[PDB]
Paper text:
4-(4-hydroxyphenyl)butan-2-one, commonly referred to as raspberry ketone, is the major fragrance compound from raspberry berries (*Rubeus rubrum*). The final step of raspberry ketone synthesis is catalysed by the NADPH-dependent double bond reductase RKS. To begin, the RKS enzyme shares sequence similarity (77% amino acid identity) and similar kinetic properties to the previously characterised promiscuous *Nicotiana tabacum* double bond reductase NtDBR. To complement these findings, we also present a crystal structure of the NADPH-dependent raspberry ketone reductase, which we use to relax its cofactor specificity towards NADH utilisation for an improved low-cost *in vitro* engineering.
Author numbering:
A (entry chain B): 9 to 40, 44 to 66, 71 to 118, 121 to 348
B (entry chain A): 8 to 348
Write the structure that this text describes.
């Protein structure tokens, strides 16, 4: 059968563009070995993928070969005993209709949620929100929480977890549509459009007159400098991402780190890879909340591999509204 | 009546401080408290020069943590003094104390709860401005409460020959860590290797590429950075941290005299290396003071911990000694002796 693929053309400098990926089709036979033959259903667009386009923490993409990243797929055939034909899995797969995988995947049991959730809410981004918030921030009822990129895959979940814990939660996002989602769907206490704030420090002083106990950091740069002098004593910054920096040849300087001393702040980075032993517990905690409607999720869903390059590039302009999903083929 | 020489704060400072930002005057005073006073009459013996005092020479700051100095009034800071007279039953004449006092020969103290009563005089009294006072406590709290050090881990100490750093490094050695310090002269580097027992040490002024220098001294990276300096030094450390590394943010003295702090560019290293970078203030740790003293005094007695002070004689020399911190003039902990006892 035919197998369209999104190919990585060549290593990227600065921002990515659609020409850095190329669409192609190849002829393949659907059989097989100890590996796995997958029909790819959904693909995630995740900000970290930009780092794999550079010639730090995982191998770079290989020019001429398909983009790889997190997806949800159906097992067509297996030469490994732990997976059988018909299994649904999430994990790393290729940007293509069908992939042969030499491997680590999670077998999906609960199918009474939209399968696309295993690219986001129930996949790596949701695990990231859970680990960063519950394992790094030591949150307590009554504490104030600021979430940057608050309407995104990770942010929208951090904010809801913080509300469930009894925190006072403010988010920022880059459009009126996203700010409305934060206040009207996700139940943030307050939210603002950071692109329309002339002075970020002023906005944070208004929304946190007594300071910020917890900053869930997704953005870096200027936003982090605005946060630092607004932290409360013994405040915490969970350093999750710094997406404002990912396309710079030279990262921007952050000037306000003396605030860490005078406010005795713990600023700690983490990688979700180190928390996957908690994935079972994460499911135990979140799947009931989804059931009882305490946790909701917004996805941005585009159809077809042909649209995956623009969906990935759109992350760095804020084009996605919520978690960016690419539908290769519905279940 | 006796004379009371004083160091007066002349006016608020912009940029680096200079001698002329302070004034020396002599006043007449009577060694007697007012009737009904509940305060202390102190004779000041030793004064500390400490880097944080620069912040008090500016009128106001977003990140202020204490009131600034008042122009026309004496400099205030940590010192060691003897009680001459007391309106507070907790102190009797002849008691020796350490805590905040005036840059003068005699002070009257109203707020007496910052004062620690010295019990052990088995040691030079000057120790209570440094090793056994606030800088020593800082090193103890920052290293043992913030850094979670373990045997075999690698430790980098900036301003390592200073009041805080020289103790951090020795604590690290005693814990079984591998310790490298940097300082800004050959004299200081020699102390690090030959008196304090650091595994290695370098003069950071001799290294045009600090990141490369740290790669040479830490071939497998840094578990713990005891941060005293900030700026380019911090940026050189960040890519050299190990996974689950820790930075104890104690001070950033390279920033204290700038109108705009320098930008630190390598913070994404915190993510990929899962580093905890945590600031702290020693004032939050004085509940551990008794335990600190129980720990360090036997080490001092057994010669297992040593200390280097920079000692200048006389209040006339105090302004130069404070200014000198910011160009590295002090060799070890900067002390001013007001009256040698
Ligand atoms: N440490 C880990 O293990 C880990 C794991 C996953 C993700 N992360 C990080 O978590 C963060 C969010 O990931 P996500 O999946 O949830 O992405 P996302 O929020 O769904 O999408 C990215 C968003 O970033 C915002 N953005 C882009 N450029 C920006 C800029 N220059 N300044 C400010 N905001 C900008 C946009 O939202 P606006 O419209 O609001 O601008 C955009 O929608 C990223 O930094 C990611 O790298 C970390
Ligand atoms: N609670 C707290 O958080 C707390 C408490 C006390 C102190 N501190 C901080 O800890 C640090 C050390 O204090 P300390 O009492 O021990 O002082 P110190 O080291 O005894 O004296 C200051 C030293 O700073 C170094 N220095 C000056 N300018 C520098 C620059 N631009 N770059 C690099 N090094 C520079 C000099 O040493 P070189 O010759 O090596 O340059 C100088 O001797 C300070 O930043 C201080 O504010 C924090
Ligand atoms: C789930 C992952 O594998 C990566 C998460 C991520 C990590 C670092 C970063 O800078 C952005 C996203």
């Amino acid at each position: 059968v035919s197998n369209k693929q999104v190919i990585f053309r060549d290593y990227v400098t600065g921002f990515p563009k659609e020409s850095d990926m190329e669409l192609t089709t190849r002829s393949i036979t659907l059989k097989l070995s100890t590996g796995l033959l997958l029909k790819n259903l959904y693909l995630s667009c995740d900000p970290y993928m930009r780092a794999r386009m550079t010639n730090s923490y995982v191998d770079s993409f290989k020019p001429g070969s398909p983009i790889i990243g997190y997806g949800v797929a159906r097992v067509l055939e297996s030469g490994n005993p732990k997976f059988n034909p018909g299994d649904l899995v999430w994990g790393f797969t290729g940007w293509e209709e069908y992939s042969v995988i030499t491997a680590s995947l999670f077998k999906i049991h609960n199918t009474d949620v939209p399968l696309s959730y295993y690219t986001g809410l129930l996949g790596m981004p949701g695990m990231t929100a859970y680990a960063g918030f519950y394992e790094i921030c030591s949150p307590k009822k009554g504490e104030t929480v600021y979430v940057s990129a608050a309407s995104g895959a990770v942010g929208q979940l951090v904010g809801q977890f913080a509300k469930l814990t009894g925190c006072y939660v403010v988010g920022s996002a880059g459009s009126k549509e996203k700010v409305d989602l934060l206040k009207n769907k996700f139940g943030f206490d307050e939210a603002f459009n950071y692109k329309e704030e002339a002075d970020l420090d002023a906005a944070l002083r208004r929304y946190f007159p007594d300071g910020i106990d917890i900053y869930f950091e997704n953005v870096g740069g200027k936003m982090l400098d605005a946060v630092l002098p607004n932290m409360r004593p013994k405040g915490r910054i969970a350093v999750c991402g710094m997406i404002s920096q990912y396309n710079l040849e030279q990262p921007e300087g952050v000037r306000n780190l003396m605030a860490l001393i005078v406010k005795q702040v713990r600023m700690e980075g983490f990688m979700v890879f180190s928390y996957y032993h908690l994935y079972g517990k994460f499911l135990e905690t979140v799947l009931p909340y989804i059931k009882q409607g305490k946790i909701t999720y917004v996805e941005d869903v585009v159809d077809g591999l042909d649209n995956a390059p623009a969906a990935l590039i759109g992350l760095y302009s804020g084009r996605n509204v919520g978690k960016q999903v690419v539908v290769v083929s519905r279940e």
